[PDB]
Structures are given as structure tokens and as C-alpha cells.
Design an enzyme around this catalytic site. Structure first.
Site, PDB file in Angstrom:
ATOM      1  N   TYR C  93      32.848  39.380  36.903  1.00 43.02           N
ATOM      2  CA  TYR C  93      32.423  40.093  38.104  1.00 43.02           C
ATOM      3  C   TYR C  93      30.979  40.559  37.959  1.00 43.02           C
ATOM      4  O   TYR C  93      30.589  41.085  36.900  1.00 43.02           O
ATOM      5  CB  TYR C  93      33.360  41.285  38.360  1.00 43.02           C
ATOM      6  N   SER C 189      38.527  37.724  32.724  1.00 46.69           N
ATOM      7  CA  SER C 189      38.494  38.691  33.803  1.00 46.69           C
ATOM      8  C   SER C 189      38.394  37.952  35.156  1.00 46.69           C
ATOM      9  O   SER C 189      39.319  37.188  35.466  1.00 46.69           O
ATOM     10  CB  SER C 189      37.404  39.713  33.560  1.00 46.69           C
ATOM     11  N   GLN C 190      37.352  38.147  35.962  1.00 47.76           N
ATOM     12  CA  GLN C 190      37.238  37.386  37.225  1.00 47.76           C
ATOM     13  C   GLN C 190      37.284  35.888  36.953  1.00 47.76           C
ATOM     14  O   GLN C 190      37.962  35.150  37.658  1.00 47.76           O
ATOM     15  CB  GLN C 190      35.968  37.748  38.018  1.00 47.76           C
ATOM     16  N   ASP C 275      43.811  47.633  27.821  1.00 54.22           N
ATOM     17  CA  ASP C 275      42.898  47.238  28.881  1.00 54.22           C
ATOM     18  C   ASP C 275      43.254  47.976  30.180  1.00 54.22           C
ATOM     19  O   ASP C 275      44.266  47.700  30.798  1.00 54.22           O
ATOM     20  CB  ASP C 275      43.009  45.715  29.068  1.00 54.22           C
ATOM     21  N   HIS C 304      39.192  46.044  27.439  1.00 53.99           N
ATOM     22  CA  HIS C 304      38.921  44.859  28.273  1.00 53.99           C
ATOM     23  C   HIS C 304      38.168  43.753  27.522  1.00 53.99           C
ATOM     24  O   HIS C 304      38.166  42.611  27.957  1.00 53.99           O
ATOM     25  CB  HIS C 304      38.212  45.283  29.580  1.00 53.99           C
TER      26      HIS C 304
END
Lengths: 324, 324, 324, 323, 323, 324
Positions: C93, C189-190, C275, C304
Site C-alpha cells: 500500500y 500485504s496489499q 500482526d 506486520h
């Protein structure tokens, strides 16, 4: 690290825990009210010079707890009506009556609005003009109002506020233009807690608007809330470690849950499921015990703002239907 | 940790940093405004069912930037006077037009209130109904509105907003009951920065109310504000390190300081000396260059709330004197 | 404060919450991809003048959503072999394709690396060069990409990103040195959310690396995450109280859990038990529904960052075993 | 809350605060280095079975402070050229050598890379494999900044800096390294170490010094209440009788005092919003830096500095230098 | 964000999780203590120039882990009695022995007080004068919790607990000290140390154990993300390959395993909102504690526990115990 | 976030800002003390069975402000000497007299210690037993004690606390073992500010120990302190925006700077240069105006803890030299 959460909604909807209240709860309030009713109400409405054009504003004074003189505003919308419905408005923590123009919503919707100023607060987000008067010595306390006089219900701060609030509805009923069949008591947070009390104790309220109420289910509150006003009670207990049982005994006489069980008038509640100031478990404890006809607007993503301006439209619709 | 402070009041009052604008600033604005004037304004005032009794609320639509249809509210207080004064109200960052009942102050004071919805926003604290339209490609940006199209003033978000805002005054003027000679432009924070732009760019505004203005003195804003909307620009620059000159060139066309220097209408400013969102040094830079008759209310202990309800009273008093 | 926790591991391994998707989920994606396949892919590679010595770096351009031209990097390590395996890399992101030398890991391990730029982002931690294109009006939104066009799956930001991402695998396959039997899709993640979508929707991907994935189990994500990108959605709902049902309807079309259930290719997942950006319950929901052969590396004490460099080695060993 | 700020750039460029060092500064470092040089360097390079394909990776061991064995990596890009230039790489606070694949930048750009592991750290953001060896380990605040701080002879950075000088000698012993084209490089703690090496070693041809730590301690403790510099303050909050001694000790390790002695070409970088390594501390060192110099100024960056943009600048700086 | 909570009191009172220790736990502690018993204790009580008037103060030194010299204070209240009871006081994390006037409580109540300084700490809230002595100091996270954590033989609290057992012997050697009324006491790190001593010392008569740290490490790292327990988690965050070793090392120092073996009478205290030493960790230890025992529960307190109310409780507990 | 800083030491040493006080400052205090002296002091010492063996502890009651009965402790160390020096100890904000064993230092150093309980506080970190009695109504205030009765010096909370404190010395002095030539007044923070007032107002105090004093230089304090008790004043002013002159007018009567100018007895001060609760500029403003023989211990790296245990040794040494 951890975002706030409470019981999931299916559990909140069934949450009707064991109430705690002393056997002399009603007697305490009866005697409290009887002692204060000995002093004449003497409601004064002084028309005041104002820049407002659509609303007429009055400076209010009336006798609340033990004859002590409580300020308010009365806001009267200019309409061709010999009688009007009335909302009695109670104010959030650290607030006070402010200016007449801070309370334009209800007048703009065609209701006379009686704004009760809050004794001793009025210094946090909106000014106030009314002093508190202790019941005797002002005991050691944690900063704020939650622990003022907490070692005895007779000396407790909210005994005086709730008495003022009951008296406020009588004062509003004394204004000639007020339609005594359509007097509403309303409040958010501290206002909501006060309103719950008034819904049980008043002989004049016809409907309750109770948003995100504070002063509900204290033992569960102090478990969830480490910030804000509930934490004043915890901080007091951290130091007065021998006063746990007395503190919660005092608070039981002021708990919105115990008031809700006594209330008969119709009510609209609202709750924010991510509200970490007034946890939804505490709000639902009161709502579920509320004994009058009731609905609740549930805002699952909102914090202590609850429904904000959406809820205000819901309140207008609710009252129109109730009173049509 | 350290309390926010800016320059001392003595220095703030004389703070007049060297302005920077491109040679074509006025031409950029002439050209933008002329192109938008090619579409009919087509202002629509459709009475809708608020539940208001002291005010009649119109759902407004009007053509702003490049004929794009912008929403608003028009609130008319229930008074006979055939031509009433009017406040055009622009909205804070991440807000939108909300409900008609969110804007009762000016109507209650006797003024028609034209509330302009903010394109693409309306999702942060009050809801909105008006989309944005990009020129063409939606360039890489940081989350928010501050960096949307920032690589070119022609593509820049506030180009569209400020044009909408100028057109809004024309739309307010079209309402039959609005007095053409008593149209005020007002706003706080983002609303303040928009009103400030409009005070330079409109020929129809009669006075400016500019509270704690945002969109002022960008270079210094980013040195002081690491949170909230100014930080968006800094965060864009932290990544796009090659784009400092281009970013600040673009922003110079939208800087409140540069509009203030051209503004000629009477204005009342407010500032909070502990405002760490809109620092007093950015507000004073705009205020000291403001070319029209001007006063500023200074709130030395307030943060971004500024004067709040005290300031609203000051605005009513200011306009009453001005219109006599 | 309370440190972050989610379900304990024995519960996480068994967590298969009931899925929600609309009856037209598959048709939505078939029509989406078919509409974009009408425009030629037109994959274009141009050798870049680079200071790199162990890698040939190419500028990439290809047709993504509705023929919009998406940027990328192709990094080919200078080796003997005729054909090489390939990693298609999606980005976290607020990131973008940055410089060729930002993506040295996979080439250094002997894999061609196709880095897809992320439309309209590239401004938070690493620059990007690709614009976004809205369908029509850019609706009221909360700052960021999570609520951009969220009132309609057809207008939702991730519709365009995921299509770009499916088309990225085709673009990679068109480089003649790429061994089409060994095209891997990877992200964190994204990036992991994008890759998870592509694992369902692509016909060319042979394996998935999905780390601490985002865009998973949206209902639960907003309960647990009040910071970072998932809270954009929550903030949008706090304001747009009337749109809850619509918002979650839209997000169901893009939720990794629903894609996981359709995906058949071999996959390696990773998750951090502490996370609080991508909660382990949201990651496990997707992992447990994943219908292809699968393993997951579990990092009990990581936030994370997940397995970081340890996890990078795990992926190398995994792919080597898969392809031998 | 007031947002972090330091002196304006026009003042930072002119900031040359009065330096403080003891009269035996040079003697201290000469004795330290001579004493450690009496033990054999004994650099060991052991080719590793790696998954890397564009790079030959070597496990490194060499003798640093007082014969103590220090880990490292040598990463060699697989290229034609028989002698390659070399970047000696020092590591940020709480880091260690991690994995060979954590250091791919320089090999990928055609430079042999020597990664020196950091004694006793290696547990914060990237793992390490080299222990420290103290004597008594005096009372200290948690971390490395106050370890042995009551005496420069026992101070933790005496050992790190000596390791770092020796690292350059270890890199220069590798056959494919061109001993006449060795560079020293580091960010934050790495940058502070490299700045020590710039003054203490005659072998490096250039200094890459990013957002340097270990600079202008007196100033750093006025501005930094979190992160590594605050360890010193917290130590002083308790040991209220040790102020003079603590600062006396730190003067032997202050980048400002090493800068004044360093003659090699230098590329520095600074973030004007860096609250970890404040710009006043970086500029104090940069302004006393005696060799040919330049500084890339990132006015909106915090401790990340110029990141990848600065990596490009470093590649171009060394390319021009080695033509 | 959210208020701290642990298991509710009803569950806390029956929380007895499955213990984990190595087969050689007792063997490890016997060898440790025997190895340290080969060095002479050599307690030194040097009378001080002190401004105190109700108390005589000694500067103490004794032999702890492997004959290493540990500092301390001895505070003797001026009373008409020839044999007096004694409290051996251990100190909280980042503290040390400070000044003699820092420890006036127990002497003011008529007890001789032996305050043991804490090796290598004394730098966070109260100064100390005693160094640690490790061998190589492995890569660690800043602080004491992960110092030498890859081997119980090298672990920092091996040396602290040995010091602490040896401190009781040094107190007993003071001629006024009544050897039948030696109490061991502390809070947090102090309470963790005291709990080890309650299992390892043959000289302790009673335990005062407040809000004890070093308890039930596995669950502690799940609830506590700041303060000393989080040093372990951060070490583990980077040293992902060492989870098993780390917790195996920790099992030898866990107050839960010591509690299981302690026989002497004890008074515990606990804060139910303590986010530093969570009540689940404290109750695990309390519930396993094998001696006669009571616990003061303070439902609304954080890590402060019962504070001065608890001090009163202690004085009454020991009065009733020794009467 | 900016680490706390104030004026550098070279500047702090010369910091003597222009004083502000009303022309009736002396008259206000003389009238205040004269009215409270009309009531019998009636100091009660009750031997109170504690477990202390080196110290005799007494429960104390005495007449403070307007004869109101204040609690305290008297701790007498068991020494042979017939007369002993005495420290009158005042207590920090939100504390109270606690238990006798919370105050063992000065007795352990051979001083009789008189600990005065603090009216209405005693609920934050150490419990108290003494109530406050207001001057009639308890006006609107912000939570805490800093704005209790702030609109008039006759009603201000610290009027009553300072009066109590002066009388405390009279109470201590009345005890037969106390050497009246060696009566010390001591405190830190709130206690230091109280002590400072008592050094101007007591005729029996022989020496002042004044650590990191609070209640000093209120104007500057509120410019620098945004948390803790000084910020109570700021928050009250944020709301009562019309009360600025009155608030500061009231505070000048209780400001340690103004008492310092009138105090003649020998003093030892202490200051932490990174103290963000009682900033060093506020402390140096008091010290620089202090008119008796004086020394200050300066702790460059300490925050509000100041010199801690180090300073306690300085105090003992200071008093020993002082008393020959």
C-alpha cells in the site's frame, strides 16, 4: 496495539445482568426529592436581548437541589402556536449552558427548548454559570466530578445534579406556552445518564431521548474504560484501597440501569458499538432493563459520536409519531 | 514532550514573509473562471422535507467547475423581509453538506445560508453528495485531497473547488429573497481558505468571515504541522523527492497569502495561538497581507477550535455594524 | 493499554467463517476480464540505461484495465540458461515500482522479476509512475484507495488494480526468456491480496507466494484494525451510516477469502501472530479456504514484518522444491 | 504537541560549534590501533552454499579489537573484471550481518561488498552472529551507548571502531578486491562508524556517510529523548555525579572530532526532519569534515534520509571518482 | 484503544497451567551453587560516615556468582536489643543499591535490612555500583532479559540468583542478625529474585513477594508488549530460529518452577490491572507455591500493587509469624 | 515530537521577568492570616499505635484556614536530645498525608517531621483524610484544584491551602520537643510552591527547602505545559474566553515568584532542566527573585524527579552547615 471491543451484538441484545441496588433505593430518592421540594421552585424566565431572529431566548433560574438556584436557557421558536412541545436538554460532561445559540436544533424543529446548566462544570468544552454547593465538607477526591462526595450517597455530586434535573422539567412545565402533554427529556452521554434518572423520578416527562448514556453499569464500566470520566472512579480506588465496597454502594443509587427498571415513559436510545467512553455493554444493560416502551438505534462502526446528525433525524421522526 | 508554540504575538503581528507567486497567477485564474462561465449556472432550489419549522430548506444544485453540478443547501429563515442578507458557507476538510439541520446558526440570526458541498470529500465527519471529476489521469498521490493533481495547477484539486466556490456566490445571488448587497462569504479551516480565495476572485461578495484558515503559507505550514492535512504534502515530498520545486510552484496558485494580497472586501479573521493544525504564523501571514478593511480576533489559549461560540457572536456583531 | 491479540493458534488453524459473496461473483470477474481483453495487451519492453551490472533492466508498458497503459520493471539476471523462471511482484500500500535497483532479490536468486506499478499510489514509501482512471464521477471518499468507488463493484478501485494484475502475468509471459511453466505471483500485504486475486483469476500463474495478505475477511478486519488502511473503510462508514450494506456488498467481490476458495495453484503463505495491520484471523480465513496445495509459515512473535528475510529464504526453497 | 524541528538550513550550513576533545585524543587511537595490530588479522573467507546466482557469497572471519574474531560477509558479483572495487559496509544500531541476500545493492552495481557484523548487537531488526568481549561490565542503561562509558579504554565503541578499521584490512586481503579502490559506507550508526574509519584508516579512497549517528553528543541529548541517544541521558539522570566523565569519554568517539581529521572525499546525506540523528548533529560533523565534501539535503525526510534516491547519488559519486 | 485485562479473578484463583522445565533443573542449580561455594564468601561490613541518626549504615561487599564481588548496604536500627530480625531486600529492574537513606522502611520497623545491589544495572531509576562479569557477550537485545539467553549456563539471571542466595548467607554472618528471622523480600524483579531464593536458600525464614517479575515467561510475552518482558519478544522477532532455545533457557529461571519447590511461609501481592507483571503470571507462581502462603489482591491497581497499604500488611504478617 | 527544552542555563541564571501583582497583595494576605488567627490553633497530638520502632508517630489535628480542622502526622525519632530540629513537609499534587511510614527520611536524619495533609486532595498517588470547605458556592471549574474558585482570590483554593500551611508551622512549633530556632519548611512540586508561600508568610520558619516548585510564574507555565496540573488553567481559559484578565489577576496572589521577592530566610532550591511539569524558567524566575540567602542545585538531565535521592543528601548537608 489492541482496538476497543465489547460483547458481540447477539450477546449485547440478551445482556440483562444481575442488578446491584440497596433495599432503600426508592426511599433515598423519595426523601431526597421531598426535602428539595420544600424550597419553592420559583421559576424565573427573563426575556433577554439577543441577535436571534427566529427564536425568542430567555434566561432561566429555578430551584433544584435544596433550593439552590440553577441557571438555564429557554429557547422558544417564533411560531403561530398557543402551545408547543418542549424538549428539556441535559448537557455532556465538562459542559455548561453556553450561549442560547448553542441549542438551536430543537427550536428549529418547532420545540421549545429548556437547556439545564450543570452545577459546577461548564469549563471543558462549553462554558457554564451555575455553582455546585457541597453537602458539608468537600471530601478528598480525584480530579473531576465522578468522585466528589462518593463516600456517601447523601453527599454525592449526582444526587444534586439529578435533583436539579427533575426540578428542571417542573420549571419547563411552568412556562405558559409549553404543551404539558409533550414534554421530552433528552441527553447524550452525561446528559443521557441524567435523563435516565429523570425518566424514573419525574412526574412530568412524557418521552425520553437517551443517547450513548454515561452513568450506567459502573462496575462493568471501570473494567473496560481506562480513559475519560469512568477512570476517575478507578483512580480513586487505586489510592483509597479500603473504600471499594462503599464506593460501589454509593454509585448504585445513581446507576442508569437501576433507573431504567423504574421508567415507564416511551424512549428512543442510541449506542455506538465501538464507543470506548460509554461501552455498549453498559448502554445495553440500561436499555434492556428499561421498562417503558423503547427502541434503540444501533451504530456498529461509530465511537462515542454514536449516530450524530442521523440520530437527530431519527429523534424528530420518533417524536412526531409518538405525539401525532 | 513539548507544548505547541509558534512565533510570539508581537512578531506574529508583524510577520510578513516574502510572497512567492508565478508571473501568470492572475491569468491562470481569469482563464479558469472564464472557461467555467461558458456553462449555464442553472441554479436549482428545490424545497425538501427537512422537519424544520423556523427555516425552509432547499436542496441546491448549481454548475461549478466546467459545468459540473455541485450540491448545496439553502436555508431561509421564516421572516417576511423581501431581501435578506446571505452567508455563503464553505466546509472544513473531509466534510460535506450533511443535513440542512447541521447549519442552523446563520438562519437563526436572520440570514439566508447557502451551504456549498465539497466535491469528492464528505466522508470524514459530515457526509457529502458531490463527486469530483479529474481533468484526465488521476496521477500518483498520497491519501487525501492535498496532493490530488499536485504536479500541475491545471490538474490540481483546489482549482476545481475554488471555481465551485466562486460559482456558489453567483448561485446564492440568484435566489430571489437574497439581498445582492449583503452576501457574506464564510468558512473555518478549509472553509476559511476557500472563502479567502473567493474574497479575491468573486465580484459579488460583500464581506469575508475567515476563521483559523487552512490553505495558507504552504512552506511554513509543512515545517510546523506533521499531522492532519498539511502533512499529506510532506509525505508526498518524502517519496517524490525530485518534485519539490514543481509541488511548491503548483501550491503558489492556491495559497491564501497570495489571494489576501488582492482581496478588497471587509473581513473578520480569527486565530488560535495554540492551533497546531493551522499555525498562527500561517494565519497571520495571510491576515497581514489582506488588502481590505480587516480585524482579527485572537484566541491565545485555544487550539484549532479557535473562538468557537464566542467567535460566532463576534461575527454577528461585526456584520450588524458593517451593514449599518 | 492492552497488547494486540487475535484467536489462539489452535483456533486460527480451524477458522473457517461463513463466506459471503453475491450470486454473480464469477460473472462479474468474467465480464470484467473479457471487457479488458478486447484491448491488445501490447507488452512493450525497453532496455534501460542502468548502473546495474548483474541484471539487465527493462522499462515495461502493458495494457491493464480497459487498455490503460500500466508501467513495470523487468529485471533479468545475466546468467547462462536459455529460459528462466519468473516472479511477478505486486506492491504494498502506498508504494510503486520505484527504481530497478529496489527489486534485486529475485534476480539475484536467478528469477526474472516482473514488477507491476500500482495505479494512482506510488507516493507513501516508494515512488510510482502509473495514473488511475475513474469510471465516471470520483464519488465522495475517505482519504486513500480503500473507499475509492466503493458504492459499486463496477467503479471500485481494486477492480482496476486486480485486472491490471491478471494482465501483468500475460505481459510477463510475453518476454521470450520467461519459462512459462515457472511463473510465480508474489506479494506482501496489499501485494498478497492482489496475488491472491490473481491466483483465482489467472490462467498463466503456476505458483503463489502470499505474505501477510491484506484485502482479506473485511468484516473482521474492521473490527480489529483501527489504524492503517482497513480503518479507511471504517471511517467511511462512521460518516456514511446509510451505506453499510452497500459497502460490504462491494467489498465481497474483492475479498481474498472468496478468491482463495477458487484458487487451485500451489501456494506458500506467511502470517505474523502479532500482526495488527493484517490480523492473523483474516490471513487464516483466506489460508484455510485456499483450495490449491498449500503451506503456511507461522511467525508467532512477529508483527506486520512477518518472517522478513527468513521468509524470503523459505520462498526460495519452496519454489525450488516445487519446480524440481 | 510541538512537531520536531532543528535549526533552519541557512543556520545549519553555518553551524560550527566549538569542538571538545582531550589532549591525548590522537595518542589514545594510536595506542589502541597499535595494540590490536599486534594480533594477526587472519582473515578467513569461506565460500558458502548459497541460493544466490549472480553473486558469490563468503562467510568472513577476521581479527578486530585485540584479536577478537568478527563475522562478516563478502559478496562478489560474478563479473569478468579480475580486480573489482569494494564497498566496506557498516550496520545500523541493533542490526547485524543478517543474511547474504540482505546486502545485494553494491554487488548488483559491480562492487565487491564487505559487510562487517556488529559485536554484541544483532537482535533488533536484523540478526547478527558476533559477540562482544568486555573486564567488568559496569552498571549501564539498557543498550550499547552506555556500555563501559566511565572510561574510554573500556567504552564499547573503542572495540567497534577498531573492528571497523580492521575490516578494511580484511577486505583488502581478498584477491579479487582492488586494494586501491576500497570505499567505506554506512547509514546512522554505520555512518558514525565509517566517519571514525575515515580518520583512523589510511586505506579507504572515499566515505559514504548517511544520516550519521555518534555525532555531537552534547547537542544530540538536548534534542533526542527517544531512541539510542536517550540511553546516554537516562544514564545521566541516575548517575548524577558522572556528567563530566561521561562526556569526557564520548569526546574520544564523537564524529565531529574524527571529521576534523578526515581527508578523503565524502558524500554525506541528511534528513532535515530526522529526530533520531538530528540535522544540527550531522551538520556539525559535516562542517568540520576536512576533506573534499558534499551533502545531499532532504528537507522533508526523517531518518530514512534520501533512501533509494541517495543510493543512486552514491553510485554516480563513486563512478566519477573511479574514472 | 483498550483497557488492560487478564483472566477474571475466579479463573485466576485456579489458574495452574502445565509447568515446563528440563529434566536437569535441580542438577543445574546444585552445580551452580556448589561451583560458587568454592570461593570464600568474605562478607565485608565497613561502617560508614552517614548523616543517619536512628540507623547505623554499613558499606557491604560479598562474594556472589563465582567469587565476584557484589555491593550492598546493611542498615541496623539503633535499638536496645542484641539479636534483631533481618530483611534481605532485592531491587527492581534497572535499579541498584542507591544511597543508604533509600531503604529506611525496614530499619524504621525494627529490622536489620540487607540491600543487595544488582550486577550491571543501577542506571534507570536508582544508581548502582556493582558490575556484571559474563566469556563472550552474545548478540542481545538492549537490556538484561536477553543477555546470554542462548544457554542457561551463560544467562544473566544465573549470576543474579546466585548472588541473591549468597546475599542471604552474608546477612546471616552479621553478628546482630537473628538467624531465625531472616526474611527475603522484593517487588517485580525483586520479587522474581526473592522467589528463586525461596527455593535455593536453606537460610530464608519467610518470603515477601510483590507483583513478581520473571514468572510464566510464555504467557508474559503474549500480554506484555512494552517494558522488560518485551525484550525477549524483540529478540525472538529477529532470532526466529531460536524460539525453542530461548524458552528452554528461560525455564531454568521461571519463578513458577521455583514456587513449586519453595517451602517457607510467603506473602504475595498482585495488581489485577498490572500490565507489566500480569496477574495471570503472578497467580501461576502463587498457585504453584508449595509453602504456607497468602496473597493480597488489589483489583484496581496497576504495577504499583498495594503500595503503602501492602507495606503495612507485610509488617503484620511477619509480626504474627515470628510471635 | 519535540523533546522538551526551555531557555539555556546561561539565560535561566539571568531570567528575572517583569513581575505582575496587585497593589493589595500584602493587604490580602495580612487580612487572610489575621482572620484565621482569630480561631484557636488547638493543636492535637495523639500517640498513634504504629509498628514503627525508631520513631514515635502522632496523629495531628490543627486549625488552618478559618478554624477548619486539618490533619497531619508528627514523626519524632527516638533520640536522647531534649530539643530537636523540625521539618514541616508539604505534599505534591493529588497526594495526601498517607501513612506515617511514607515520611521516614527526616526522622531518620534526626529531625522531627510535621507532615501537613492537603485539603480535598489525597486521591491520586497517596491517600488523604482532610476535606476542603469552600468559600460559599463552588464555581464552574475544570477538573482538579488549579481552577477551584479561580475567578476571585478570596475564593481560590490555594488561599485556604497556604493559610493551612502557615498554621502548620505554628502547630509544629507548639510541640514541646521542637527547637523553634530550627524549623525548616520543605516540599517538592506543589509542596515546594506551598513552602515558598510559607517562607514569605510564616514568622516562624527558619529555613526553606524548595524542590522543582510548582505554582510559579503562571503566564509562562501555561505557554509551556500542555499536560498535568498547569494545563487545568489553560483548559479553563479555552472555555472561559472572557475570563483571561480575571484568572491571571487571581493567580498573581498565589504565585511563588511574588512570595519569593518577600522571603528572607535561607533557602536551598533545586531544578531539573528537562522538567516539563515545572519548567526550569518558572523555577529560576522564583529563585532569581528569592530575597533570603539562597543556593540552587541544578540537574541538567533530570525531568520532574529533579535531584531525587542526590538532592536529599544536599538538603541534610545544607541544614547541618546552616544550624552551625
Amino acid at each position: 496495539h489492541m482496538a476497543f471491543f465489547d460483547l458481540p451484538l447477539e450477546e449485547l441484545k440478551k445482556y440483562r445482568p444481575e442488578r446491584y441496588e440497596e433495599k432503600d433505593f426508592d426511599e433515598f430518592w423519595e426523601e431526597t426529592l421531598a426535602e428539595s421540594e420544600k424550597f419553592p421552585l420559583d421559576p424565573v424566565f427573563e426575556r433577554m436581548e439577543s441577535h436571534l431572529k427566529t427564536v425568542e431566548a430567555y434566561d432561566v433560574t429555578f430551584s433544584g437541589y435544596r433550593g439552590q438556584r440553577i441557571k438555564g436557557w429557554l429557547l422558544v421558536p417564533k411560531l403561530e402556536e398557543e402551545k408547543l412541545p418542549c424538549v428539556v436538554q441535559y448537557i455532556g460532561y465538562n459542559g455548561g449552558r453556553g450561549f442560547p445559540h448553542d441549542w438551536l436544533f430543537w427550536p428549529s424543529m418547532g420545540y421549545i427548548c429548556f437547556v439545564m446548566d450543570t452545577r459546577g462544570q461548564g469549563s471543558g468544552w462549553l462554558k457554564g454559570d451555575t455553582p455546585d454547593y457541597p453537602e458539608g465538607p468537600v471530601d478528598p477526591q480525584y480530579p473531576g466530578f465522578m468522585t466528589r462526595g462518593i463516600l456517601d450517597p447523601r453527599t454525592y455530586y449526582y444526587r444534586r445534579v439529578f435533583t436539579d434535573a427533575v426540578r428542571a422539567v417542573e420549571a419547563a412545565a411552568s412556562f405558559p406556552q409549553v404543551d404539558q402533554e409533550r414534554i421530552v427529556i433528552a441527553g447524550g452521554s452525561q446528559g443521557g445518564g441524567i435523563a435516565l434518572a429523570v425518566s424514573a423520578l419525574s412526574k412530568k416527562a412524557k418521552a425520553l431521548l437517551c443517547d450513548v448514556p454515561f452513568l450506567c453499569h459502573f462496575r462493568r464500566a471501570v473494567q473496560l474504560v481506562d480513559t475519560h470520566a469512568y477512570a476517575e472512579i478507578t483512580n480513586f480506588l487505586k489510592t483509597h484501597r479500603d473504600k471499594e465496597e462503599i464506593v460501589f454502594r454509593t454509585l448504585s443509587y445513581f446507576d442508569g440501569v437501576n433507573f431504567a427498571a423504574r421508567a415507564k415513559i416511551p424512549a428512543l436510545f442510541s449506542v455506538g458499538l465501538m464507543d470506548n467512553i460509554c461501552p455498549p455493554s453498559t448502554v445495553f444493560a440500561a436499555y434492556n432493563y428499561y421498562a417503558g416502551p423503547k427502541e434503540i438505534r444501533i451504530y456498529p462502526y461509530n465511537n462515542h459520536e454514536g449516530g450524530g446528525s442521523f440520530q437527530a433525524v431519527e429523534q424528530v421522526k420518533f417524536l412526531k409519531k409518538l405525539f401525532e
